[PDB]
Design a protein around this ligand. Structure first.
Ligand SMILES: Nc1nc(=O)c2c([nH]1)NC[C@@H]1CN(c3ccc(C(=O)N[C@@H](CCC(=O)O)C(=O)O)cc3)C=[N+]21
Ligand SMILES: Nc1nc(=O)c2c([nH]1)NC[C@@H]1CN(c3ccc(C(=O)N[C@@H](CCC(=O)O)C(=O)O)cc3)C=[N+]21
Ligand code: NA
Ligand code: NA
Ligand code: NA
Ligand code: NA
Ligand code: NA
Ligand code: NA
Lengths: 354, 354
């Protein structure tokens, strides 16, 4: 199939800033370039478009070209025969939007546009609605080829592919998803099909918080089921509440607010009474140990927390899905969609140091 | 001061169901009874009201009475001179509401009603609004004496006391809070003053999820700051999103939905690329290890997840505080308060096994 990868990947970031050969493995080139080489080795007709191809050293460029990858700096020309367009584009503001809007009229009929860790597919799909109406591109599909790893490292053994699950309207077809699954299996990677909204919390760097919180909830569920002998309904309410509260505090008041309002000393004290089976509670015990010296590890945050004051009140435990249902019933989806747009932009209050 | 503790504490639960002397320490009686004995030893005029005082063994009853605690089965008479009324009442439906509504006209002027781990003070305060209007008890204060531990165990060294912080309207006065702080310091306990909405996620059994997720977010913040060298705004967005998503999934689809939709295999794979400094990432490493055998530990949930299907779509990442602000602007608080009522009731979809 004809695949165009947009973005080589930052050579300096993966070599000097984050020592990827040392911390994870493999050798440069990492990122979009590695993805392209793999698709080309599988026998796909691959093009890699990047405006800075001339800054790539000759030895690395030659290695990429030898695999069969066609290199170019022309994004529009690179889109012309593309059945799959993968955006390995900057975190930087507006670069991904610009590229997607520019290639949109040139992609082949039924082409699918895929984002990676730097852009939510839902944010991109929403941003392009008027362009789709104007260019009559309702045939274009939207999904992801999220590596949830750095391509070129031994850890990259899969791709997270966004599906229509949990969405009100579809953004991709079954045929398009099959093409993405094939790109993954043709290159020896496991294809993980997830609801589109979950690709980011599962694939991005936040997987650390996602997995620790999820593992912590299962640990609390096992203590509740086996030791406290409490009701499932009570256990699920406690998990939902704890996580909604922390999320609300970080969103509204930042990490400094989260720390000042929850009270680390209180959490540490309270947690002592839930250490009921040391052998069956690895995370509780590990977390308790961390809370003991937490102030030495994050002095900069402890200082912000000491100078923090909540500017206005809020309902930290209000369950989002319940507020979402009420809002949808009261004003409808389009009106509600003009909220998930303002959230991702923060990736405002953070800028103003709030 | 005159304090009335409502509820002895369940002798069978703390001795046979949860082996408290073995798992935590100390000796029976645990709970409300222990709290009463401590306030009586400090020199307070203490009354303990419980309908089942005659079921308490004589030796345990004698030990309580010897400390100066007045035992009774009459809740109304027990309220008559009470400056502080502490509800160490059942998790069981409507028992706490009944007692609070019944003693409300008899408490002394400016008395404060305190809940413990079995009832949110905000839920109770909301439920009693018409009774307060009718009995002209706008002088009554609402707060907590949450042990965030089992009173009588060596771990119980503090109390969580609800304040007006983060609330739109106050529920307690400074004088009332000072009385609670005194009950705590008079009995050698640390007084932890928290915003009323945070007493439950910090004090209740959910502290396991609260502390693991919080510790996990700080661990991810340190990896982001020191190793990835990414922006604070990006880090806080990732923490907020991860936790909002997990909370939304558990609230709407239960633990079985959470497990099926996030995909444990995907989370485990993705997490491998964020293990960047083993020595500085205890929770990531511990969580990764747990995900490896997670299916053997919770087969009952893995089976529900296999038979799970989302009934309707939702926005799992919608930030609650943003939806709260919009709702408050669109319909006002009273209209919005008729939502936090339906949430706590679940402590519906859970009952229907959804
Ligand atoms: N499951 C998984 N998902 C990931 O998404 C993932 C991972 N594992 N392992 C490590 C790579 C690395 N990573 C970065 C995050 C932010 C910046 C970032 O903020 N870069 C800025 C500037 C960085 C700088 O110059 O210091 C930028 O490109 O604009 C970079 C790299 C996430 N990764
Ligand atoms: N920081 C902290 N906060 C706590 O709130 C806390 C703690 N540590 N350590 C352990 C005690 C124990 N605990 C229970 C939770 C639910 C039931 C429960 O659901 N009981 C049911 C029935 C129990 C049965 O009969 O099996 C009931 O009373 O109706 C009991 C006990 C929370 N505790
Ligand atoms: Na996230
Ligand atoms: Na902040
Ligand atoms: Na809901
Ligand atoms: Na909780
Ligand atoms: Na459930
Ligand atoms: Na907000």
């Amino acid at each position: 199939m004809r695949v165009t990868v947009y973005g080589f990947g930052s050579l300096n970031y993966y070599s000097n800033k984050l020592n990827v050969p040392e911390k994870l493995g493999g050798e440069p080139p990492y990122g979009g370039s590695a993805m392209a080489v793999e698709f080309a080795k599988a026998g796909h007709d691959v093009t890699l478009s990047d405006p800075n191809i001339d800054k790539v050293p000759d030895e690395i460029r030659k290695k990429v070209e030898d695999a069969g990858v066609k290199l170019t700096t022309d994004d529009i020309e690179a889109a012309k025969e593309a059945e799959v367009a993968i955006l390995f584009t900057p975190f930087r503001g507006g670069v991904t939007f610009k590229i997607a809007e520019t290639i949109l009229p040139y992609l082949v009929e039924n082409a699918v546009i895929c984002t990676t860790c730097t852009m939510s597919i839902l944010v991109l799909n929403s941003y392009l609605q008027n362009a789709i109406f104007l260019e009559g591109r309702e045939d274009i599909g939207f999904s992801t080829m999220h590596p949830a790893a750095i391509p070129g490292t031994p850890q990259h053994k899969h791709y997270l592919i966004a599906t229509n699950e949990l969405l009100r309207k579809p953004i991709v077809t079954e045929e398009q998803i099959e093409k993405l699954k094939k790109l993954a299996t043709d290159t020896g990677k496991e294809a993980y099909l997830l609801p589109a909204e979950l690709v980011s919390p599962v694939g991005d760097m936040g997987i650390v918080t996602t997995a620790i919180a999820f593992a912590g909830a299962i640990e609390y569920y096992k203590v509740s089921r086996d030791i406290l002998k409490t009701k499932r309904s009570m256990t699920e309410f406690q998990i939902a509440q704890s996580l909604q509260v922390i999320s609300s505090l970080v969103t509204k008041y930042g990490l400094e607010g989260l720390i000042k309002l929850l009270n680390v000393d209180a959490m540490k004290a309270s947690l002592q009474s839930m250490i009921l089976d040391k052998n069956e509670q690895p995370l509780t015990v590990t977390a308790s140990k961390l809370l003991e010296k937490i102030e030495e590890t994050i002095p900069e945050l402890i200082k912000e927390a000491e100078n923090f004051s909540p500017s206005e009140p809020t309902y930290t435990s209000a369950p989002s899905p319940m507020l979402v249902e009420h809002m949808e019933d009261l004003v409808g989806d389009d009106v509600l969609k003009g909220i998930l747009r303002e959230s991702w932009k923060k990736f405002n209050v953070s800028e103003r140091n709030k």
